[PDB]
């Protein structure tokens, strides 16, 4: 074992590797939303850029895990990044609804990770997740939730002036 | 009697204590409207912050009467601050309409106070009322009435696009 | 069910509503203390200002819990804010001892809430309480304890000159 | 009659002259207390300067009445300025107690002038009295009240370490 490894359970190491995969999957999905809203026949540029920024964010979350794995003495093991569920995202409402499901899925995985670490009595990994991830998740989820509420208020999916207005005002 | 007391009728003192509690009560109701507009399923952040600022003001108006009571040599006597009369405020129209009836209630308490001080021949408390409250109140009633007219023109309560537009332009 | 709610127990959600009411209770007691030390027959102005500033801090604590509730998908429900235990606070020593009991009471409720979040496995709420409340509680209690010690040193309640010196040098 | 006179009852013009002479009387008395605390066997310089300042304030108040009289088209008619009631002022507490009765005497004159103005339906004079005099009076009374309470706590008139401390801390 690593000269550095101390109080890092084997099951935790594996879990981080799986969690790193999920962030990357999340980043690839968002990247797809970006390409969708940028299509000439969708053309919602501010919406597109929103998904693009979230793409980079998730990718960073993943790198942060690689860094973390090494600090504790774990070994990063990488796995295919699965393509996203859809090639085409419907419209701003569907996309935000898909974004919420994805975010809630990542969050659930982080909460399970924290449950493992609790049972393994790894307070360092507990604090890492509390500090760097848990709070960012609840915040990303509130912002998407707010957007969905506004999208519905503006009459999506049927109201195109609503979708236009949202992209000019809510996002940026 | 306080060594500072001069021409301060004990009825006015009691009135000032009642008036102070009302300010706090109004402040607490705007708090409530703030938290309501901030829920994920309501998500009107500019309207929310408008009500935050109005609750901060009302609390200040209340503090100003604590100082005032002491300046005159009267004694501050606190009472329970009553919960606001709703837990959900429906929509921005109902909210502003609740707000209007609130401002009017407060204003009427302020005028009855001025009447009292007038009949007790207390010009100091008359002038304090005139300079620090009565003018601030008609501006707040005017603003809220303007908001209300705008919300109606925008087709509240049925028109969500209009509720959305109100949050992006009438407030900030 | 809030589109945003995840791993947030209703027992925890009610406890947050209870804690929010306590922070406001605290805040109101500190107001009372501000108004008492401002009296022409008390007239210890730096002591008043200390208490006014605690009355703000405890109020901001209550607003954090409102946001918190909405971030997590819970719901603010407000209750009457009880008036304070005393209309008069005796002197600086008696005030500080009452503040001590209040912070300790506020502190224990936070400790209880933490225990609940734990039993219910809500790491986000535990970390929130750790980072935003627990620490400040502990510093606050320390400051007041220190104060009570110097006021005793200064001869309170009997030594008027000691009381005047404390207000001149221990706060501002 | 003055080309300018309008809605100015002669009872008022005369009361103004009485009020003017009274300010000058109060100014002189404060003067006396300045020279008392500047005595080599009194030597409380911060206390003496406080009274020196009030002396100039009360004189600015008399000058302001002259100007008023002329604006309304009254005529200044000056009287003797009666020497202050004492040549010697005991100590700080005694002097503060005297200043209190003096300020309240001035205040009561100001209130009687307002009542006059009200009975004669002179709103101009009422606003002048309210704006330039009345608020400033309760302010000066509250301060002197605060001072006395502190001189008492400092153990005056017997505790001279008290009197020394009050000069160094309560005033400047």
Curated annotation (Swiss-Prot), chains A, B, C, D:
One of its GO terms (molecular function) is ferric iron binding. GO terms for biological process: intracellular iron ion homeostasis; iron ion transport. CDD domains: Ferritin. Fe cation 2 binds at residues 58, 103, 137, 140. GO terms for cellular component: cytoplasm. Residues 6-155 form the Ferritin-like diiron domain. Its EC number is 1.16.3.1. It catalyses: 4 Fe(2+) + O2 + 4 H(+) = 4 Fe(3+) + 2 H2O. Stores iron in a soluble, non-toxic, readily available form. Important for iron homeostasis. Has ferroxidase activity. Iron is taken up in the ferrous form and deposited as ferric hydroxides after oxidation. Oligomer of 24 subunits. The functional molecule is roughly spherical and contains a central cavity into which the polymeric mineral iron core is deposited. Belongs to the ferritin family. There are three types of ferritin subunits in amphibia: L, M and H chains. M and H chains are fast mineralizing; the L chain is very slow mineralizing. This is Ferritin, middle subunit. The lineage of its organism: Eukaryota, Metazoa, Chordata, Craniata, Vertebrata.
């Amino acid at each position: 074992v690593s000269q550095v490894r101390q109080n890092y359970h084997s099951d935790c190491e594996a879990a981080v590797n799986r969690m790193l995969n999920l962030e990357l999957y999340a980043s690839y999905t968002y990247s797809s939303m970006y390409a969708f809203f940028d299509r000439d026949d969708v053309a919602l540029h501010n919406v597109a850029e929103f998904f693009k920024e979230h793409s980079h964010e998730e990718r960073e979350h993943a790198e942060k895990f690689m860094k973390y794995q090494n600090k504790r003495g774990g070994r990063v093991v990488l796995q295919d990044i699965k393509k996203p569920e859809r090639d085409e995202w419907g419209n701003t409402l569907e996309a935000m609804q898909a974004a919420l499901q994805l975010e809630k899925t990542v969050n659930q995985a982080l909460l399970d990770l924290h449950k493992l670490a609790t049972d393994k009595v790894d307070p360092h990994l507990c604090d890492f997740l509390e500090s760097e991830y848990l709070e960012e998740q609840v915040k990303d989820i509130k912002r998407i939730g707010d957007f969905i509420t506004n999208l519905k208020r503006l009459g999506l999916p049927e109201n195109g002036m609503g979708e236009y207005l949202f992209d000019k005002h809510s996002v940026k």
